[PDB]
Amino acid sequence: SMTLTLNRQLLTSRQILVAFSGGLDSTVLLHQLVQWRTENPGVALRAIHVHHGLSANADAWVTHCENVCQQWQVPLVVERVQLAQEGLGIEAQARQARYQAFARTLLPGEVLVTAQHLDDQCETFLLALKRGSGPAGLSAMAEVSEFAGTRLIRPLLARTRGELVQWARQYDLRWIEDESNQDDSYDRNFLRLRVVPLLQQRWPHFAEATARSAALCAEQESLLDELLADDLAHCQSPQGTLQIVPMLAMSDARRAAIIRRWLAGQNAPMPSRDALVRIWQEVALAREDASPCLRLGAFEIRRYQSQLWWIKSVTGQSENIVPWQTWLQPLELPAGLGSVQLNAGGDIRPPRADEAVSVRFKAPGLLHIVGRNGGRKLKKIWQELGVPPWLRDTTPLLFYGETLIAAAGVFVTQEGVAEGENGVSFVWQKTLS
Amino acid sequence: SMTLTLNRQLLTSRQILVAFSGGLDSTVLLHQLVQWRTENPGVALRAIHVHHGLSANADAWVTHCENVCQQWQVPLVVERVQLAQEGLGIEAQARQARYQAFARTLLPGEVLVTAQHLDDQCETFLLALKRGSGPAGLSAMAEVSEFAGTRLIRPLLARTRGELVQWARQYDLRWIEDESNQDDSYDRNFLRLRVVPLLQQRWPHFAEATARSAALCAEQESLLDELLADDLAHCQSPQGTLQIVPMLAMSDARRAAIIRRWLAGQNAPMPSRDALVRIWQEVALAREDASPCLRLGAFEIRRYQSQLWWIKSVTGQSENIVPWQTWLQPLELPAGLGSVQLNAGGDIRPPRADEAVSVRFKAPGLLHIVGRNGGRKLKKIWQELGVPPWLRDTTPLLFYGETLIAAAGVFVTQEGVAEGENGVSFVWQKTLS
């Protein structure tokens, strides 16, 4: 039935790439896939062993993987990524390097498949538990998730190590397995060896019961997904923000479940239940006048126009002034804001080779712009044009000497309009995400 | 703050009864209550030690409890309930006897209070987990629940054993504590001593994280409570049944959450997620023609009139015939169906001292009843009158010789109508629930 199970989960896939450590689970997953390939002509399969850290057999494991793949006619990428600096041990440092390694060496349209099984579901659950997470975090792992643009499928997720042993053995597969005892100071190890077994003693199927609970938590979260759909549709704008007004009346749990689901949409890192609390109390209910902001890692959620925004944090630049001596060539902007350049053809007057061109993010005094008869301050103009506060000091400002010419993609001052009709275009380019 | 916490949870209470084993938690809870009484004049407090099983100090513990209560001026009920027959050990047999003991010795209007703390929340969670239960069952314990008509409050539910030790010690309270090592074959013991501690090693606050998860599961179930309210109102009749038709269109999770919440309303034992599945697939979607029935312990859920019913199972009696030689005196019915009697005054003709009166639950041939011009079979009459199938063979039928006179509270045959106007009343009495 593991083969039966395999094809159902892999129907929507043609190109697979399996994380292949010499181990049982990988060995059983891979043998099954090579078994699967022989049954579906035209199906391409690739394997990838990730050699990381200074293991005693780190080099031998690689060799073992090269023989098995070849004996089975399967290409094999072998990333040697290395990283460890006294910080977060194996159960963190490496896991990232590995998934990055998977990300790196993964073709487009190819589906990443891992050999994570029941015991891992139990371990994930426990770790979530020891973190005091709710139903969302206790749903542990999904049979199908999104990873590096594509999907990450986990077939053997429901299978027991017993089942895997019974298979790997029935087909006389040879596999490695260095328990690495002394890694007991790294959470996921301390479980499989000490806690979990201790549990399987009086409760032989403990790990099975846990997947059951995980599954039930998931069913409930999806029930809420259904139940909240409308609420979400209404409060979620097309832009990708969340309308505050429609929520002012809701209950704390309602709000949190929505904020939660909304943050998931931006494919954001799962928030802590208290984070969800702060977001509403300190941001949504905060005065827009006082620029509300909750830092959540590299990202930040804030309030603007009675809406909550999930955006990639970026450091201000109001005090910066980046000179453009060679404005004939693009100018690289600070804090990865991208490049900027003056192309022939546009409503902005070119600079004289005698004046000093520069890029800034601030501009004093009353300012006059095209399309408005008046003259207000930068901040007033920003507001009238709807430019969000986090962008009011991160938007390129063209300056010839001490004069403001334009604000990339937002406006052009009147003192900067093309005299004749020729003129140039101040163009702003941002790097890939 | 434990005192602060105490009064908030006990405001809606005047008469308390604390399950008092000599232990820390009880000792700390009780001392705090005697502390609480001194601060709220007119507040009555009672303690109850439950002596059960053949413990080495079973008798000494009692004595210790008698001294402490007296030293503190607190009445003390001491139930000696005993029960153990090789079946379900302490973590089952006794727990029932104890709560029964609590039930028995509890005054009306009095609130039962127990000294269950954080560690118990963790243990309850784990047990639920090892049972593979979902969010509803993983909410573990509530600060306030219903027990024997009244409420069961658990103040110290959030407090750590540490906190309790720090208190019992700060007020120099003396308490007992016989770990009873060899009870390790009884689930809740195997946890507190082996698993939990093993966990608190690498995770000192594991038990605290677990209450956090329990709490979050609860918040979500209440979120659903809110979200499903309307659905429940609509599908739940006034009688206390569940309308099937309005659910036919819903999704599996929706239905289950409703069936679940509905069963809770009848204050029924929490159902297994699969039970919820069977109920719908085997009962709701079953043909009423084929009398659908799912036995869930002493109770059973069934289908009648496009509705699901939660009712106290009762064995049929269609084959039974209980003679009434002394119809002048009440007749005790089988299978705790209650008693039955003929009172002077009613539309039924009395029996002659020459005919043989009896009670039955079946009746052959075409039958003629008052208020209908015709003559159909018992089963047809039952149907036309709306008598549920489980009651069609558990309803007393008056028989003089071989003639049907009446069906208690349902109908009177035409051959049994009072000749003149005097007549008697066939009255059916059922015992307390």
* 3-state SS track over chain A: CHHHHHHHHHCCCCEEEEECCCEHHHHHHHHHHHHHHCCCCCCEEEEEEECCCCCCCHHHHHHHHHHHHHHCCCCEEEECCCCCCCCCCCCCHHHHHHHHHHHHCCCCCEEEECCCCHHHHHHHHHHHHCCCCCCCHHHCCCCEEEECCEEEECHHHCCCHHHHHHHHHHCCCCCECCCCHHHCCCHHHHHHHHHHHHHHHHCCCHHHHHHHHHHHHHHHHHHHHHHHHHHHHHHECCCCCEECHHHCCCCHHHHHHHHHHHHHHCCCCCCCHHHHHHHHHHHHCCCHHHCCEEEECCEEEEECCCEEEEEECCCCCCCCEEECCCCCCCEECCCCCCEEEEEEEEEECCCCCCCCEEEECCCCCEECECCCCCCEEHHHHHHHHCCCHHHCCCCCEEEECCEEEEECCCEEEHHHECCCCCCEEEEEECCCC
Query: What are the backbone angles phi and psi of residue B335, rounded to the nearest 5°?
Result: 35, 55
Residue found under tokens 């869930």: B296
Q: Is B26 annotated as a binding-site member?
A: yes
Q: Residues of B with CB below 8 A from A198's CB? A: 194-195, 198
B24 in a known ligand binding site: yes
> Residue A335 and residue A332: Cα distance in Å, rounded?
10
Q: How many Å apart are CA A426 and CA A406, to the nearest integer? A: 8
- Residue A30 makes CB contacts below 8 A (sequence gap 6+) with A18, A20, A47, A68, A69, A72, A74, A115
Are B199 and A191 in contact by the 8 Å Cβ rule? The answer is no
Distance between CA atoms of residues A121 and A186, nearest Å? 17
CA nearest to B268, candidates B239, B292, B299, B241: B299
**B175 neighbors B72 (Cβ within 8 angstroms):** no
Nearest C-alpha in B relative to A194: B198
Q: What letters, b where the CB count within 10 A reaches 16 and e where it falls short, cover B167-187?
A: bbeeeeeebbeeeeeebeebb
Q: Strand B44-50 and strand B15-19: pairing?
A: parallel
For chain A, say whether B251 makes contact (Cβ under 8 Å).
yes
Distance from CA of B192 to the nearest CA of A (A): 13
In Å, how far are A90, A99, A108, A149, B403 from A102, measured between CA atoms? 17, 5, 12, 12, 86
* CA–CA distances in Å: residue A178 to residues A57, A124, A159, A181: 9, 21, 21, 8
Contact B220 A134 (CB under 8 A): yes
The tokens 């904020």 sit on which residue?
Answer: A259
Report the distance separating Cα B46 and Cα B432, nearest Å: 28
Is the Cβ pair B195, A198 closer than 8 Å? yes
Would you call A427 exposed, middle or buried from its count of C-beta atoms within 10 A (0-12, 13-18, 19+)? Answer: middle
Contact B220, A134 (CB under 8 A): yes
A382 near A395, Cβ under 8 Å? no
User: What's the sign of the alpha-carbon dihedral A199, A203, A208, A211?
Assistant: negative
Whether B310 and B301 have beta carbons less than 8 Å apart is answered as yes
Q: For residue A131, which residues of chain B lie inside 8 Å, CB to CB?
A: 209
Sort out which chain B residues have CB atoms less than 8 A from A195's CB and list them. Answer: 195, 198-199
User: Is B89 touching A (CB cutoff 8 A)?
Assistant: no
Contact B202 A187 (CB under 8 A): yes
Q: Are strands A357-360 and A76-79 parallel, antiparallel or unpaired?
A: unpaired
- Binding-site residues of A sit at 21-26
Q: Which two tokens stand for residue B172?
A: 């120099």
Contact A130 B187 (CB under 8 A): no
**Residues in A 99-158 with any Cβ partner in B closer than 8 A:** 128-135, 138
Task: Report strand pairing: A44-50 vs A15-19.
Answer: parallel
Smallest Cα distance from A412 to chain B, Å: 51
Length of chain B: 433
Break positions in chain B: residue before each gap, C to N over 2.5 angstroms: none
Contact B68, B29 (CB under 8 A): no
Instruction: Provide the resolution (angstroms).
Output: 2.7
Question: Looking at beta carbons, which residues of chain A come within 8 Å of B140?
Answer: none
Two structure tokens written together for B392: 């069609």
Distance of CA A324 to the CA centre of its chain: 35
A228 to B227: CB separation less than 8 angstroms, yes or no: yes
Neighbours of B227 (CB within 10 A): 21
Who's near B185: CB < 8 A, 6+ residues apart?
A202, B89
Look-up: residue for tokens 């207000």? A376
List B425's β-bridge partners, or say none: B343
DSSP lists the bridge partners of residue A339 as: A332, A429
Residue A204 to chain B, least CA–CA distance (Å): 10
Q: B257: alpha, beta or left, given left = phi > 0 and alpha = psi -120 to 50?
A: alpha
* Contact in structure between B111 and B17 (CB atoms under 8 Å): yes
Q: Using an 8 Å Cβ cutoff, are B171 and B31 in contact?
A: yes
Tokens of A171: 């087909």
Q: Which two tokens stand for residue B432?
A: 């307390």
Residue A334 vs residues A250, A356, A357, A396, B99: alpha-carbon distances, Å: 42, 19, 16, 10, 70
B269-278 long-range contacts, Cβ below 8 Å, gap at least 24? B269/B296, B269/B297, B269/B299, B270/B136, B270/B137, B271/B296, B273/A216, B273/B133, B273/B134, B277/B252
The packing angle between helices A252-265 and B206-235, to 10°, is 100
Nearest-Å Rg of the Cα atoms of chain A is: 28
CA A223/CA B101 separation, integer angstroms: 41
Best of B125, B129, B198, B232 to disrupt the A interface by mutation (most A CBs within 10 Å)? B129
Each residue of A296-322: b (16+ CB within 10 Å) or e? beeebbbbbeebbbbbeeeeebeebeb
Structure token pair of residue A154: 């986990």
- The answer to whether the Cβ–Cβ distance between B223 and A257 falls below 8 Å is yes
Contacting residues of A for B199, CB less than 8 Å apart: 130, 195
Tell me whether residues A220 and B138 touch, CB distance under 8 A.
no
Which residues of chain A have a CB within 8 Å of the CB of B206?
130
Region label for B310, one of left (φ > 0), alpha (ψ between -120 and 50) or beta (otherwise): beta
Are A377 and A365 in contact by the 8 Å Cβ rule? The answer is yes
Residue B211 has phi, psi (to 5 degrees) of -70, -35
A189 touches chain B (CB under 8 A): no
Q: What is the 3-state secondary structure (H, E, C) of chain B?
A: CHHHHHHHHHCCCCEEEEECCCEHHHHHHHHHHHHHHCCCCCCEEEEEEECCCCCCCHHHHHHHHHHHHHHCCCCEEEECCCCCCCCCCCCCHHHHHHHHHHHHCCCCCEEEECCCCHHHHHHHHHHHHCCCCCCCHHHCCCCEEEECCEEEECHHHCCCHHHHHHHHHHCCCCCECCCCHHHCCCHHHHHHHHHHHHHHHHCCCHHHHHHHHHHHHHHHHHHHHHHHHHHHHHHECCCCCEECHHHCCCCHHHHHHHHHHHHHHCCCCCCCHHHHHHHHHHHHCCCHHHCCEEEECCEEEEECCCEEEEEECCCCCCCCEEECCCCCCCEECCCCCCEEEEEEEEEECCCCCCCCEEEECCCCCEECECCCCCCEEHHHHHHHHCCCHHHCCCCCEEEECCEEEEECCCEEEHHHECCCCCCEEEEEECCCC
| B202 close to A (CB below 8 A) | yes
Reference B314, options B329, B330, B328, B302; nearest CA is B302
| Residue A181, number of CB atoms within 10 A of its CB | 8
Domains of chain A: 1-227 (3.40.50.620), 228-313 (1.20.59.20), 314-433 (no CATH)
Closest-CA residue in chain B for A221?
A: B220
Name the residue among A332, A337, A333, A331 with its Cα closest to residue A313. Answer: A337
Q: Which of A19, A36, A138, A25 is closest to A81 using CA atoms? A: A19
Say whether B42 counts as a known binding-site residue. no
Maximum alpha-carbon separation in chain B: 88
Rg (CA), chain B: 28
Distance between A125 CA and the closest CA of chain B, angstroms: 10
The label of the residue with tokens 């990381």 reads: A52
Name residues 259-278 of chain B within 8 A of A (Cβ): 273
> If you count residue pairs, one on A and one on B, with CB atoms under 8 Å apart, how many are there?
110
Say if the Cβ atoms of A213 and B187 lie within 8 Å: no
Token match 């008092």: residue?
B20
Cβ within 8 Å, pair A224-B222: no
**CA neighbor of B112 nearest in space, from B204, B214, B9, B199:** B9
* Inter-chain CB proximity A254 and B228 less than 8 Å: no
Does A206 sit within 8 Å of B130, measured CB to CB?
Answer: yes
